Amino acid sequence: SFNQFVDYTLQDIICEDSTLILEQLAQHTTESDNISRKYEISFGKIYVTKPMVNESDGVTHALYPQEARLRNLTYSSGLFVDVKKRTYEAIDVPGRELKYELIAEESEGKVFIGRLPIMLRSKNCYLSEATESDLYKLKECP
């Protein structure tokens, strides 16, 4: 159940309300200010890292289940999403429908959106690819 959620459900959830549009109307106050802006933020693919922990000093290193249990830490990985920021503007002539046009500003980076706890012995856990000898090295019970 967890593998299905992480593999497919996470992407689907973000692909429902990915687009956020803010519309700034003409705000007719003078003939020198008649342009209407439209700023759009869209969420693309989502990436998941291996389990990791960030310390107080800001150093991040791979976290294994044994250390998490002893250090009272949460066994979780990081979530990243590609964000595209687009802005549209057009000349808002009074009493007419607008035709928004791309204004040559389409930024397109990875944004951290929180940490997802990882179930042990899952596709995203370190113990899924570990053999019996590897588990003994990691102080994990086969």
Partner: peptide, 9 residues
Amino acid sequence: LRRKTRQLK
């Protein structure tokens, strides 16, 4: 006037 800020779905 308007609120000069609105969201389109």
